[PDB]
């Protein structure tokens, strides 16, 4: 961002960024720039997530077209210079440099293109310098009419207006590159725990439950495996398990007799919230007995109840 010089929209320079961290909120809370429009993610959320790299992309255009910097948005530049997908993810950053790049005469430096035989696919730069041809007869290479060099020079003026004031653009890619995580936000690690239902963010993945020791093996690259439904059950070592989800049935003599009641708890081990366990769970408010009757109120697995 402090890079003095910026490449051109037709040679829009780009950079990988891994093995690092990003106190992004600054870029949001600096406010020194015009646009920090963030698709894909929530600008005010980029501290807890994280990724493995960032394709940092920087180019320059007129503010007139930063709107052209929008996925699925049509724009000659956006059509023949720089393309975004229909399913991009990331944030667009672009800012005026009239103060830093303008000079009397039209700064003829920042070169840009007009034509093409086709529209570029996303992130598919094109540097070509071949002579654009609109005439059936190929010039092979005498530019002029129906035989064209493809690029024009903005030539920004110290006075030029807003839509012609030059705004620098930087574009960030956070493409949920999940396999390992290497580039991450600012956060304070915490001490692991087991045998207690706890929320978690292991390398960017939110869940909750209990954390018990794994017994299986992974490989020197493997970060996690999921059992079915794409449900992770181990991370970096541990196996995962939810914490108990059970059902609640209330038992009674029927009101007309009383207001006293029984508590059912399903498929649970009531040590894990007088008492009584079954193949149906555990029961709070009743007594296991040794007598023998007919079944009035059924629980299951053999356990009925009455007065």
């Amino acid at each position, epitope marked *: 961002f402090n890079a003095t010089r910026f490449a051109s929209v037709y040679a829009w320079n780009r950079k990988r960024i891994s093995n690092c961290v990003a106190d992004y909120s600054v870029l949001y809370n600096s406010a020194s720039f015009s646009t920090f429009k963030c698709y894909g993610v929530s600008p005010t959320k980029l501290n807890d997530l994280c990724f493995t790299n960032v394709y940092a992309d920087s180019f320059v255009i007129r503010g007139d077209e930063v709107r052209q910097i929008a996925p699925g948005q049509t724009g000659k530049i956006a059509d023949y210079n720089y393309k975004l997908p229909d399913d991009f993810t990331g944030c667009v950053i672009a800012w005026n440099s009239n103060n830093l790049d303008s000079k009397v*005469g*039209g700064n*003829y430096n920042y070169l840009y293109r*007009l*034509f093409r035989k086709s529209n570029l696919k996303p992130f598919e730069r094109d540097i070509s310098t071949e002579i*654009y041809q609109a005439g059936s007869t190929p010039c092979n290479g*005498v*530019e*002029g*009419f129906n035989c*064209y*060099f*493809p*690029l*024009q*020079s*903005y*030539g*920004f*003026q110290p006075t*030029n207006g807003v839509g*012609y004031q030059p705004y620098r653009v930087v574009v960030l890619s956070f493409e949920l590159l999940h396999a390992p995580a290497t580039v991450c936000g600012p956060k304070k690690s915490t001490n692991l725990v087991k045998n207690k239902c706890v929320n978690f963010n292991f390398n960017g993945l939110t869940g909750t439950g209990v954390l018990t020791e794994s017994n299986k093996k992974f490989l020197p690259f493997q970060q996690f495996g999921r059992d079915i439904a794409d449900t992770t059950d181990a991370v970096r070592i541990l196996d995962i398990t939810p914490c108990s989800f059970g059902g609640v049935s209330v038992i009674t003599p029927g009101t007309n007799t009383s207001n006293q009641v029984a508590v059912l708890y399903q498929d649970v081990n009531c040590t894990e919230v007088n008492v009584f366990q079954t193949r149906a769970g555990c029961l709070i408010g009743a007594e296991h007995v040794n007598n023998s009757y007919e079944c009035d109120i059924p629980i299951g697995a053999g356990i009925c109840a009455s007065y």
Partner: nanobody, 125 residues
């Protein structure tokens, strides 16, 4: 299809400064030429006044204009301007927009050159 909107014509005392203009817009520069003018004479033909490489600083200038006139334009604004400074009286003739082609030297010939109707520019005295 290549038009040359002229501006700045008319009479002027001998020894003045001015800004004439030549503009092309909505054209999608293909991609960058040199741009300048010529000067025909009521009796004599046109003269090679100057050139300037579209969207580029490189330029040409005539011995007369090269000292008291400067051709300056804005492709963002899509025009050019040969500053009519010092307005020599000899500058008494209709001045013509001239579209030099992809090459800057070619204009030196000027035959295929595109033109604007021609701003009559008499430098009166």
């Amino acid at each position: 299809q290549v038009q040359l909107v002229e501006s700045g014509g008319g009479s002027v005392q001998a020894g003045g400064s001015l800004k004439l203009s030549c503009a092309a817009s909505g054209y999608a520069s293909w991609a960058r030429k040199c741009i300048g003018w010529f000067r025909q004479a009521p009796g004599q033909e046109r003269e090679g006044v100057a050139a300037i490489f579209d969207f580029d600083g490189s330029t040409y200038y005539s011995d007369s204009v090269k000292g008291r006139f400067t051709i300056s334009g804005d492709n963002a604004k899509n025009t050019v301007s040969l500053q009519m400074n010092s307005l020599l009286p000899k500058d008494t003739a209709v001045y013509y927009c001239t579209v030099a082609f992809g090459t800057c030297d070619n204009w030196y010939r000027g035959r295929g050159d595109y033109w604007g109707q021609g701003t009559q520019v008499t430098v009166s005295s």
